[PDB]
């Protein structure tokens, strides 16, 4: 069937949706549309064509009120990739509080992970009832159902600036260095590179947590 309401969605919402780059952009809800139990979602691009979408590759155009995130809650994020910035989708980890000055850490779908603030984040409309479900990458879906459905047991290694480590990197461990720490995350040194990565403190990437 042809619906124009659906939950608390309407024909004509401006929306996000999920473009086949995995980058989120702006656009409108054209068509809604039944078959039998699913939903499809049919959004127009602003820069772009037409999509027909499942329910949890859209998004709502607003920041979602506080009291409505919790660890699990499934959300698009800014993601900064080099100097340019994208919307990308992924799982809160943690709510503000004091050990991180009122922030947000976010589990990206591609194993990254970042702080950000209330203005930075967008909420999945119909997310699945395991919200990690729709993550694509084995490895990181099953570490993120381990963290969401443990919480708030977090193992983690205490780490200081100037320590050396060893650091997955594709399949391989490298030598390394800690350079800087911010509540549950390291930034790490990979000392033949010499380029740096924020990684979370509870990662099995990180020697002292793939030992455990
Ligand atoms: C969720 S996270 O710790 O930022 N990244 C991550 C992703 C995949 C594995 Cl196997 C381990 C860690």
């Not at 799982?91 to 992970?113: H, S």
Request: proline share 4%; with cysteine.
């Amino acid at each position: 069937e042809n619906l124009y309401f659906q939950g608390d969605l309407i024909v004509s919402m401006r929306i996000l949706g999920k473009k086949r780059t995995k980058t989120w952009h702006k656009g409108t809800l054209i068509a809604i549309q039944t078959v039998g139990p699913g939903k499809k979602y049919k959004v127009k691009f602003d820069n772009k064509g037409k999509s027909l979408l499942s329910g949890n590759h859209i998004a709502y155009d607003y920041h979602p009120p506080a009291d409505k995130l919790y660890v699990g809650s499934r959300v698009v994020a800014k993601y900064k990739d080099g100097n340019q910035v994208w919307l990308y989708a992924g799982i809160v980890a943690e709510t503000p509080n004091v050990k991180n000055k009122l922030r947000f850490l976010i589990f990206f779908d591609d194993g990254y992970a970042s702080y950000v603030t209330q203005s930075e984040l967008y909420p999945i409309c119909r997310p699945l009832k395991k919200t990690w479900e729709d993550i694509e990458d084995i490895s990181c879906r099953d570490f993120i159902e381990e963290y969401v459905t443990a919480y708030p047991n977090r193992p983690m290694v205490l780490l200081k600036s100037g320590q050396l480590i060893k650091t997955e990197w594709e399949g391989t461990w490298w030598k390394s260095r800690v350079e800087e720490v911010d509540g549950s995350l390291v930034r790490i040194l990979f000392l033949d590179d010499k380029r740096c990565e924020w990684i979370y403190r509870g990662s099995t990437r990180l020697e002292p947590m793939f030992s455990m």
